[PDB]
Design a protein around this ligand. Structure first.
Ligand SMILES: CO[C@H]1O[C@H](CO)[C@@H](S[C@@H]2O[C@H](CO)[C@@H](S[C@@H]3O[C@H](CO)[C@@H](S[C@@H]4O[C@H](CO)[C@@H](S[C@@H]5O[C@H](CO)[C@@H](O)[C@H](O)[C@H]5O)[C@H](O)[C@H]4O)[C@H](O)[C@H]3O)[C@H](O)[C@H]2O)[C@H](O)[C@H]1O
Ligand code: CA
Ligand code: CA
Ligand code: CA
Ligand code: CA
Ligand code: CA
Ligand code: CA
Ligand code: CA
Ligand code: CA
Ligand code: CA
Ligand code: CA
Ligand code: NA
Ligand code: NA
Length: 301
């Protein structure tokens, strides 16, 4: 039903629209790292998220480093599993080249180009797919002009050779916070969005204002990862401020994916330790974060 309704997504004047030029707002879940918590990423869990939560997008977080694709590329099969499930379930899917410790996207540029060539050849004809080419550039000397924009200008043509139209999400500096710098020096490709990531327990009004500056320059923004906890993971969840961010995103119709669908014992995790990997969760199997996020997606489903 989701993709049947919306079809091919595109960017129109800085925001995400469907095949009729209607606003569309994607809300869903990110996996945790696929090399760690892949058991939660399967057709049955994603069908449960679609049917019980109301998700219309699922994000497959394929770490590069940290034991991910660079060391054990078999994890790409878990990405394929997620994409094929999303196609079968008629929802959107984000293929995320999940850089983090490898903080400069140029570390694994050759590998990223090969990976995105393969993924876009396989899936580029499906409107379901969204590419996220570098999760979180970070560090004081990884900047838009020197490192990130040129990386994107090399990877995007690789995708476009196979998939001229699907959305590409491009990370920004300072853990995908520096959307203002990207907005002042935008990519030419018309169907790109810039990532903005936050933690409710850490980030506040000054970053909302930074996002608004970017939006004011005509840049499209996808909140492709956010957490209900603090970035430190201390002090529980911060749902008061999370609701402030939910409202902010709704008022700007910003799409989002929440971090993350795992049973790890950390406050951002959506599930309690032991939760069934194939879905069908009881209310006792959702964490406080998961309970809140589920309600946020349900109430617009
Ligand atoms: C003034 O404010 C501004 O400057 C501030 C100072 O620099 C920063 S604070 C800064 O914020 C950033 C952005 O939020 C974060 S990075 C952030 O951290 C998250 C929490 O760690 C992670 S998700 C997290 O990823 C972990 C690493 O992979 C894993 S632990 C990992 O788990 C596996 C599996 O179990 C295990 O095998 C491994 O052994 C473990 O290492 C964890 O489970 C995940 O939840 C997110 O990806 C990242 O964005 C900085 O930490 C923080 O200091 C302000 O942000 C800025 O505005
Ligand atoms: Ca357009
Ligand atoms: Ca807008
Ligand atoms: Ca390798
Ligand atoms: Ca492995
Ligand atoms: Ca090729
Ligand atoms: Ca396409
Ligand atoms: Ca080059
Ligand atoms: Ca404007
Ligand atoms: Ca509301
Ligand atoms: Ca909306
Ligand atoms: Na290897
Ligand atoms: Na505008």
């Amino acid at each position: 039903s989701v993709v049947e309704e919306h079809g091919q997504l595109s960017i129109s004047n800085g925001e995400l629209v469907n095949e009729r030029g209607e606003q569309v707002q994607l809300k869903g879940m990110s996996s945790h790292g696929l090399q760690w918590y892949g058991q939660f990423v399967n057709y049955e869990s994603m069908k449960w998220l679609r049917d019980d939560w109301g998700i219309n997008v699922f994000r497959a977080a394929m770490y590069t480093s940290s034991g991910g694709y660079i060391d054990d590329p078999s994890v790409k099969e878990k990405v394929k599993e997620a994409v094929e499930a999303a196609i079968d379930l008629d929802i959107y899917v984000i293929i995320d080249w999940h850089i983090l410790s490898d903080n400069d996207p140029n570390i694994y540029k050759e590998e990223a180009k090969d990976f995105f060539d393969e993924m876009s050849e396989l899936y580029g004809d499906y409107p379901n797919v969204i590419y996220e080419i570098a999760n979180e550039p970070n560090g004081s000397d990884v900047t838009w002009g020197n490192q990130i924009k040129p990386y994107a200008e090399e990877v995007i043509p690789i995708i476009r050779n196979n998939d001229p139209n699907n959305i590409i999400i491009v990370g920004t500096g300072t853990w995908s916070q520096d959307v203002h710098h990207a907005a002042d020096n935008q990519l030419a490709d018309p169907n790109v969005m810039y990532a903005f990531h936050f933690y409710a327990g850490t980030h506040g009004q000054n970053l909302r204002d930074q996002v608004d500056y970017a939006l004011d320059q005509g840049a499209a923004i996808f909140v492709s990862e956010w957490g209900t906890s603090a970035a430190t993971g201390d002090g529980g969840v911060f749902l008061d401020e999370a609701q402030v961010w939910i409202d902010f995103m709704d008022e700007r119709n910003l799409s989002w994916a929440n971090w993350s669908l795992t049973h790890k014992d950390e406050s951002s995790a959506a599930l309690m330790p032991g939760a069934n990997p194939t879905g069908g969760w009881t209310e006792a199997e959702l964490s406080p974060s998961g309970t809140f996020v589920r309600e946020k997606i349900r109430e617009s489903a």
